Design a protein around this ligand. Structure first.
Ligand SMILES: [Ca+2]
Ligand SMILES: [Ca+2]
Ligand SMILES: [Ca+2]
Ligand SMILES: [Ca+2]
Ligand SMILES: [Ca+2]
Ligand SMILES: [Ca+2]
Ligand SMILES: [Ca+2]
Ligand SMILES: [Ca+2]
Ligand SMILES: [Ca+2]
Ligand SMILES: [Ca+2]
Ligand SMILES: [Ca+2]
Ligand SMILES: [Cl-]
Ligand SMILES: [Cl-]
Ligand SMILES: [Cl-]
Ligand SMILES: [Cl-]
Ligand SMILES: [Cl-]
Ligand SMILES: [Cl-]
Ligand SMILES: [Cl-]
Ligand SMILES: [Cl-]
Ligand SMILES: [Cl-]
Ligand SMILES: [Cl-]
Ligand SMILES: [Cl-]
Ligand SMILES: [Cl-]
Ligand SMILES: [Cl-]
Ligand SMILES: [Cl-]
Ligand SMILES: [Cl-]
Ligand SMILES: [Cl-]
Ligand SMILES: [Cl-]
Ligand SMILES: [Cl-]
Ligand SMILES: [Cl-]
Ligand SMILES: [Cl-]
Ligand SMILES: [Cl-]
Ligand SMILES: [Cl-]
Ligand SMILES: [Cl-]
Ligand SMILES: [Cl-]
Ligand SMILES: [Cl-]
Ligand SMILES: [Cl-]
Ligand SMILES: [Cl-]
Ligand SMILES: [Cl-]
Ligand SMILES: [Cl-]
Ligand SMILES: [Cl-]
Ligand SMILES: [Cl-]
Ligand SMILES: [Cl-]
Ligand SMILES: [Cl-]
Ligand SMILES: [Cl-]
Ligand SMILES: [Cl-]
Ligand SMILES: [Cl-]
Ligand SMILES: [Cl-]
Ligand SMILES: [Cl-]
Ligand SMILES: [Cl-]
Ligand SMILES: [Cl-]
Lengths: 261, 261, 261, 261
């Protein structure tokens, strides 16, 4: 039989933030394979990643966001898809009372403010054209918070999620879709390190460390974290014309972790 | 150079219920196009299409379920994907007090219990094998009920949605994914007839009738209903191996209608 | 100082279903103490209660609900507050596949149908008057289903919860408030016996079985189940004029069990 | 015969922030009436009101927090109930792209960070004692965002709501309850001013302005905003010993506005 491509991103210009590790890297790679023109960002460029595809910036600062917006306008001449994948938590444990003003600022800057600053610069152009998609990568912690080290992370992600829905109400009628992808635990080099650290301090092994993390989430019905490529798959679907009626929604990819209907 | 092969359903055996029209027909068509082996059901048979593709049965009875389950075993030899698409509302207006026992029975039998009977027959075999996907097509009314004629419809869809999440908790650890697709207004011949009826009654044109439907939902930010093909696209994605980490979740396709984050 | 009663139910005529054990009994007791005129129901004649305060009926049947409706009108002369407290699960374990048609019918009749039948009979007259409150006692399982024996219980409670919100949309503009109270584990003779059966099967003590229950829920942050009187307190508040702006909402009383924001 | 003593706050020491007007003033008054020892805050004390009742401070600063925390320790000797009522939006219209850095800072500082700062100082001592209640007053916009001027307000309220749930997970096991009260539109002098502004720009009257607000929310089934005293009633119930099993939950008071189950 002959093929008709079902899902691609041909002709689309995509800005993917934080695309050098984990799900970000998998999303950059998949978008390129699906025919998108891609610009991605990070504080350091991997040697194997062609310079034309990359702009170096610290997205936790206003200056870094300005640099990325500039490169988007200059290299892409317009953007059709923005995938916000910058996020993370650097706060130590100790619960709410151990969150300093610096912790709160860091969590908000990384998980909310970069997306807000970039959208404020880039989305009005997309609206002017009358087409495009914005994907905010949130986190199941926006609904299912873990307090030990991620109280401010969860709060920042919840702000992001509601902000995204608010954006969707405004710009969906003008032809720009705005969706959220909410991952649970993603298998990354960094989370292997986490599992090893927990395993050592608990006196168990890697699988024991894995179990500690999963138990800490209330269990993952699927029994494993999501793979970077799995997150990429969902983002590519939502960015594609096969998802033209999907806007103002959050699509969870977590192996069933969130235990509510 | 080569064409993109992102998503297909080659090798999958799929039972899709209620595939004669609307999103059901679009999903049958797309699954066949993506390489699946498909069986579908009809209470009354459409004239043109082959006998092998449809089994005639009333899924709202024990007899009908048995017929469909036997046909699945005989024609497909097993099933990798069950897509439940039987549903609808025939209750008249007048609000909750105008729902007779007949109305309640009709709504629960069509929107919940057909799926329940079929899953009880077929899902245990999928669990024994250790692989597969069940898709329950719910409705945004399960969260956003419209009371005039659809109070019992909304309630039945809510039961279905929570039942689906319960199943996911049980069977996801055993290798079977269970997901929900929750549509808003889908543009079908039936809903176009509804629009026409509302238009002639309000003394407006077809576009005015569609606006009456949209306003009744509280507005659709996207500005249009979903097409049958669009619902099919989402179901195919979720049924595919590109969705291996997605279980125990409901994915809404409603153009932004549900106004909560 | 002198007292002005903050919360009472003086002058209110209340039907409280299933008011002879557990939270139902505590709610009957409290409503009487707050000055309500009360009618309650049970299948069995409770030794402690004056004849006038109760009517014997099987609310899982149509004729039973008619008996209760008829008695409500005959004895109270109308009703200002309906508290639906009939509910429970008699299904055995084994997950979804072990739910027979009898199990499904029993779960729906007990947890959804009785409320539907009684509301259809009694709420229109409250609407005609332009005042009143309906309280549907749901369950955290409507959002947090436990699949082993309570898949159909959870589904029924989810139907009830969405039905309640639909009816609130219809009747709140007409002066009747409709609210839900959603309990977690309530410490009752029934739930102590469940702890026993679990204790027996696990070969531990009784509180050992209580630990099994709490662990099975994903933990209770408060560290204990709700007391019947605590459920009564919340229902009394919501039935009172101190809750006049509260309608179409579900108030959860579960010690923090549901882990989502 | 005797009068009903259902609920009071005798013996409790309560800090209620922002008690000058609106729901804050109503909550201060009700708490005093129920027998609580109360301290409240304002940027400037209203003349004629006792000096002891108010502490003058800007809770959006580290200094202001320190001042309020020290006044709490000096005047109350500790605190049993903290009711966070500081909040509001002063952003102008124009949607997301009209939200300057000033707007985002204002919204987060007033609606999230004042409460976070104060909790960080006061909650650990409540935890050490092993009893108490924290109430975070959120907003239905945390789930139902309105984009014209309140995109950042909604986002900040969503952060607050998830933060509150995170804190509840941490401190509920230690004997401190943490709950949210989420109001819809509250009738205040400020919202009368808003209705008058909207009325003017639309060339209608006050009732027309009210209709514009209610339509902007998607309609209020009850048909009116909540009164300050109504919000106070709910906060008082939750702070009382009648709510001992309620923690980690959000109780919405909005006349049915949020249209989802
Ligand atoms: Ca820290
Ligand atoms: Ca990771
Ligand atoms: Ca889980
Ligand atoms: Ca989930
Ligand atoms: Ca009817
Ligand atoms: Ca009928
Ligand atoms: Ca059974
Ligand atoms: Ca049978
Ligand atoms: Ca009323
Ligand atoms: Ca838990
Ligand atoms: Ca502004
Ligand atoms: Cl990685
Ligand atoms: Cl970003
Ligand atoms: Cl944690
Ligand atoms: Cl992760
Ligand atoms: Cl990594
Ligand atoms: Cl190891
Ligand atoms: Cl699940
Ligand atoms: Cl493809
Ligand atoms: Cl059709
Ligand atoms: Cl046939
Ligand atoms: Cl059957
Ligand atoms: Cl079906
Ligand atoms: Cl309706
Ligand atoms: Cl037309
Ligand atoms: Cl939207
Ligand atoms: Cl809205
Ligand atoms: Cl939300
Ligand atoms: Cl009992
Ligand atoms: Cl009688
Ligand atoms: Cl009546
Ligand atoms: Cl009942
Ligand atoms: Cl009946
Ligand atoms: Cl839910
Ligand atoms: Cl219980
Ligand atoms: Cl009992
Ligand atoms: Cl909690
Ligand atoms: Cl948790
Ligand atoms: Cl009282
Ligand atoms: Cl009290
Ligand atoms: Cl005021
Ligand atoms: Cl500080
Ligand atoms: Cl505050
Ligand atoms: Cl700015
Ligand atoms: Cl501190
Ligand atoms: Cl306490
Ligand atoms: Cl929400
Ligand atoms: Cl707005
Ligand atoms: Cl005011
Ligand atoms: Cl309204
Ligand atoms: Cl409502």
């Amino acid at each position: 039989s002959m093929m008709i491509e079902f899902l691609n991103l041909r002709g689309k210009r995509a800005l993917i933030t934080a695309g050098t590790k984990g799900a970000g890297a998998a999303t950059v790679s998949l978008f390129l394979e699906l025919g998108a023109q891609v610009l991605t960002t990070a504080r350091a460029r991997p040697e194997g990643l062609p310079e034309e595809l990359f702009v170096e910036a610290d997205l936790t600062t206003k200056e870094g966001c300005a640099i990325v917006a500039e490169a988007t306008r200059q290299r892409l001449g317009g953007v059709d898809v923005i995938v916000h994948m910058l996020g993370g938590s650097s706060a130590a444990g100790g619960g709410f009372s151990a969150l300093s003003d610096d912790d709160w600022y860091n969590e908000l800057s990384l998980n909310l403010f970069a997306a807000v600053r970039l959208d404020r610069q880039l989305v009005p152009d997309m609206v002017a054209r009358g087409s495009g998609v914005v994907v905010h990568v949130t986190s199941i912690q926006r609904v299912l918070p873990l307090p030990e080290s991620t109280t401010a992370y969860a709060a920042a992600k919840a702000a992001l999620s509601t902000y995204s829905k608010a954006m969707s109400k405004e710009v969906s009628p003008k032809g720009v879709r705005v969706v959220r992808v909410s991952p649970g635990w993603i298998e990354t080099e960094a989370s292997v390190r986490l599992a090893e650290r927990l395993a050592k301090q608990a006196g168990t092994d890697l699988e024991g460390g894995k179990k500690i993390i999963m138990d800490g989430l209330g269990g993952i019905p699927l029994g494993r974290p999501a793979k970077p490529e799995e997150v990429a798959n969902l983002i590519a679907f939502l960015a594609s014309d096969r998802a033209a009626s999907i806007t103002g929604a959050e699509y969870t990819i977590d192996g069933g972790t969130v235990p509510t209907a």
